[PDB]
Design a binder for these strands. Sequence first.
RNA 1: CAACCAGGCUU
DNA 2: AAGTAGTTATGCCGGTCA
DNA 3: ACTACTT
Lengths: 114, 49, 266, 65, 181, 30, 391, 147, 56, 134
Amino acid sequence: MNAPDRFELFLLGEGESKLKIDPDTKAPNAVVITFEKEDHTLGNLIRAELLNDRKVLFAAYKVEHPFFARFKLRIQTTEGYDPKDALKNACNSIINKLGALKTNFETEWNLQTL
Amino acid sequence: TLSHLRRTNTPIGRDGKLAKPRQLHNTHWGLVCPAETPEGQACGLVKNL
Amino acid sequence: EEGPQVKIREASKDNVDFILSNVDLAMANSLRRVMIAEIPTLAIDSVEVETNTTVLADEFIAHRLGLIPLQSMDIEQLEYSRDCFCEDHCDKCSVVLTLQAFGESESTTNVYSKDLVIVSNLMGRNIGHPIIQDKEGNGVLICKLRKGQELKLTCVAKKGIAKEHAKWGPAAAIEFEYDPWNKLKHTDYWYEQDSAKEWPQSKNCEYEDPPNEGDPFDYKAQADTFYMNVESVGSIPVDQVVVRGIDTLQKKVASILLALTQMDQD
Amino acid sequence: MIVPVRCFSCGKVVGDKWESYLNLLQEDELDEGTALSRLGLKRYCCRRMILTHVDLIEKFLRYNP
Amino acid sequence: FIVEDDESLGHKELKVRKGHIAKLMATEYQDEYTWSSLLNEGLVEYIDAEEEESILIAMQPEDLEPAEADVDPAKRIRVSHHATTFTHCEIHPSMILGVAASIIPFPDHNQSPRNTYQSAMGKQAMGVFLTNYNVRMDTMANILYYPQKPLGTTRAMEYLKFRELPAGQNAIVAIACYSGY
Amino acid sequence: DESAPITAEDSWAVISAFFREKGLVSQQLD
Amino acid sequence: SLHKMSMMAHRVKVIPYSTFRLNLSVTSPYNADFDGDEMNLHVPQSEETRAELSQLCAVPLQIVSPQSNKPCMGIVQDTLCGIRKLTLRDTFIELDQVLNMLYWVPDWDGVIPTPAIIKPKPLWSGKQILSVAIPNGIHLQRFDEGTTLLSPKDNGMLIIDGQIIFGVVEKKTVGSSNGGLIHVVTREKGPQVCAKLFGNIQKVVNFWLLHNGFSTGIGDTIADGPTMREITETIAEAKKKVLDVTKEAQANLLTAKHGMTLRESFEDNVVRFLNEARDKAGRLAEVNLKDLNNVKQMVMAGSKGSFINIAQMSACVGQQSVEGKRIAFGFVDRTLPHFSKDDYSPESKGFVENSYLRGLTPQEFFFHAMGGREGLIDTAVKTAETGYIQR
Amino acid sequence: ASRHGQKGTIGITYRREDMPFTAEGIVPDLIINPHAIPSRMTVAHLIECLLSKVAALSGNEGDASPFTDITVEGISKLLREHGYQSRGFEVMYNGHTGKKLMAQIFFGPTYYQRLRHMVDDKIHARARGPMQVLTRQPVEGRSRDGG
Amino acid sequence: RGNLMGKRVDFSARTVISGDPNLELDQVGVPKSIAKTLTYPEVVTPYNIDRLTQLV
Amino acid sequence: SNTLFDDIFQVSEVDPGRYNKVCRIEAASTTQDQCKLTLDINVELFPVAAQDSLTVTIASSLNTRSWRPPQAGDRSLADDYDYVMYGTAYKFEEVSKDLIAVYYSFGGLLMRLEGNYRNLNNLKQENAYLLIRR
RNA sequence: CAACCAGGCUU
DNA sequence: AAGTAGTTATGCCGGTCA
DNA sequence: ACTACTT
Ligand SMILES: [Mg+2]
Ligand SMILES: [Zn+2]
Ligand SMILES: [Zn+2]
């Protein structure tokens, strides 16, 4: 009855954006990014890869409450290095790795029987 | 539905409460159920064969 | 090749037992999830009833026609009703099925997912066919009937994913394990007397070097090499439920880049 | 009350296998525990599904119009 | 059961014998030796409350009858067949119970009150009250889509028709702390 | 030997025969 | 609604689904379980009316209660059982996750605190980050037993400047206890700050507990082999210590303790034997329960369960009773009709030698019922009689 | 509800991906809290779950009739004879990250009854509405839209 | 005792309650269905004419 | 920017009371027969068995604020040991005479020192990095 | 837009 | 000493009758 | 039950 529509777990509602980036004021050179209509799948990952760019002084994520498909990512970077960029690379890195994992699984599969 | 067909009601009384009736008697063995009975209110006054 | 490699252990048509090596746990899992939930499939989602005299009630059946797996090899070239421009639906965005059954016989007439008849044009493409793996080739016993019990429906299957509902799931169970000889201490076995003796050793114990006491605790030890096993329901070929997984997850991470740029503008 | 299509827990198809199973019982004179293993029902999530379904429909069908 | 020591071939012993029984399972498989039989061939008798006052009863027929000439560490701890006057023996104790309680699996393993609850709740639940619901016009009624028969059972259930008309489902259950919900 | 003693599992056969005849609602009817 | 706290003012937070949702710590004041309880809401109508609610009866204020000059809301369940675990010296946490735990606290000064261990691997301790939730100036000291400014047993508690220095955190520290973290934070920083403390403390630990997981099963109800047998003889011995006195009285050699019958004096001894026996039967299984045993783990945090519970599960249920005396003779001079007349042995007056693990006997079962069914009665009398008193 | 007076209502539902799992793939249908065992003191539940785990693997109606010669000790032997830990517990991994759970969880089926009384048949609210005649106060009863 | 010392009243609601580790201590999660039924009479003031007109 | 105490001790005994990954340690000084030591240790990231020559240091630096990850691939490293903790000083006892003892806690793990000559050394500060080699 | 009785649920 | 009337927890949710 | 006023 008070049940929200299922498709709200992945469809941005009229006038929302995947990302919203606001600058954390508590610390220097750090930012908080809200991912709308997304969940752990994509967060825990971007938090991880992001935890390699040693130019990254901090990175964590969190799902405010289960009822709502969305989470916040906080990123802190070295001086001169902008996080919006840190995220950029941290992503490609994810892409690139997966791309390889794609070909490689196909390789192995073709060389199969049954 | 089965369980309802096997149900017993015992008139209350004035000083109603006490214990005497509401409690599980020894002679109750094998004729009435030791566990099945309502909580509170008329507890132990309604028995199940 | 370059980064995270694979080494398919056993494999068939309904299960891709394999070993994902040199990856991040995060990623291994992300993939796992993706497979179970966000891969596009096709399934009935609107059931128009004309007549029914079965002992099962309207919605009861409806529910079922949803889970009756459907073809979906070429799903990625069919649009989501919501995105197509038709007032409601069209061959460009959906497949239509029909099902009719009369209790002709004098002895319980059966309705199988095989009696579903496509009607809309598939504009030539593998889609909408009631997946059958049954031995006798009938698949999913939809419903039974007696004397003169009729049953006339009309279905409309559309795209759709797990998040939206489970009938669109193509995965179904997905084995996942790692570090079989608790080497990272990610667990702390419960015991009465002895850990090792009471707690079963996994098959995967083999493909990895036993502990060996003496040695101290390797704390720097992260965690690579995962013994998965992706089974499938059919809709899509076991392999794909992994390739498309790897793809979908890929595209998601993509979109973040993408939106991160239309946001560059101002 | 007809066979559950797919297993609540893991989603693995199970609608088909009703008839099959019921034969590897009466005909092939086997025991539940294996009739299932025979049908590829490995883990109990799927197992519990068939071994427990009570096909009332059959008793329903036996009524009239 | 009537125990009468009428065994000129041993101690005191139950009037009913392995043949009487097999002679009954004979008639079970036929779907002529009824209950009434057991009652006329004076092998079982109806003892009300008052009369119950002057008799002696053995719980298990076996357990409480032969002689004494080790004990399982996991099994419980029964007292003993201390007596030789046994005049009657309990068909089976699990019959002190009444419908409700009989569906409870392992009641001999709960704090007494918990049992008295499941005895009242098992009546709030949903199932299949009859197979002609489809044709009944009662105000209000609920039927569970896919009823399954319990994995855990009671020998007494078989008579309560529980496996033929269940009232729940076997759910894969975990007992953990999670989100906190 | 249609005269030997009788163990546990045997009790049921009797009980089974009980309800075969009287039935869960005996009393109300009688 | 028994006392003022059964009616507090809360801030609305409109959400989906059909149920009123409330924070767990405010669960006790209402006396609410989610086994299907229903609750009423009333919406003020005037500008001054709300004022009355917002300034006078808002949960934050109602926190430390005058019923018994101590706080009436603490930490419970998951969060409680969970907070202990995140505290034991033994518990260490690695960077990647410490970063999530830090973010989860909505105040955090965005300042990673230095690991307690730098050397090989930079590790943080449960005690450490939990302290990111405890504000500044909050000062607390305790001392349970063998507490000693270096508490070997990690006992009592010493928190300084608002940072946990030593001692496990559990029910006596973070509970609705008297000298509690809560009783202090409320008093020293305001009903405001403290109400936000449940928030944090909860969120940090709740999270951590989600990944460390926690459970319980029959495996936690069985006592070590010999410890068990040792119990059977601790029963037995008292099963004798009772038998003797039973004959020592059948011969007319018992001195009637002043004021009591011989019979009254007979029982008195008996009962204090069996019970006294069961108690040890228990205390045996309790010590023999390793630390990893879940049921015990819950008993330490004080989240649920207790001694006697472990007792009747693994050890020995105990002697059933009605109106004081053990089971009576409803049947002429005996308990059931499966007994020989004039029998006063434990196995007959209602002593249940078995543990719930093992499983009661047809007599044990029925006598137990007799004892339980008594409670269920007064639970239904004490309940009404008490309600009128209240009025 | 279970069959041991273990009443409970839902608090949230999750999908497989969030749910916690066991390497073998299986996931749970419910997730009841461990704190509802100690003080309740209902072992029967605990056991039905160990018996039913077996009976599901073996495919032989599990007997949990009152006074029998069965014991946790014997049943554990049968479950050990099937590959899984003896007491039930299985290793499980947190669905969000995929990492293992430092603890081991009690697993296995258990009969659960879905009793009447669903939230949507209760949830009720009112602001000004029907008023009784004699009294002029609001009428009684959610069905009649009272207060 | 039943009409004056206590009585049935407007503006009130009731449903099943269930814990939620993510709300603040003093909040109370209210289902949309119920928020849309219950009301508060607010007076039109330059301070809110705007906001209020939106809600209307 | 400077040390505050240094010496080598020999492990009397090592104890892990119900502690799967930590043992409380005690050793005496190979100099002052006044210098006692009690210290909890992560016997996982650094094992220890009775009879040992451990060097123990202190100092208020490593040459504070928000901790940073390694990155110091190449940076100053007072790290010249095989175990470094950071804790706080809670109490400064006076076991009579002139035998003082200070207590240290490292986020739970405790320590107790003894002697008397770090008069102008052992400040009561929150600072305190502990180091141990061999 | 009611009385009266009866019954049931509030770990 | 016996009888009689008063009060007995809170709240929510199928059948007869002018 | 449990107390007070009547019988
Ligand atoms: Mg309740
Ligand atoms: Zn279209
Ligand atoms: Zn399954």
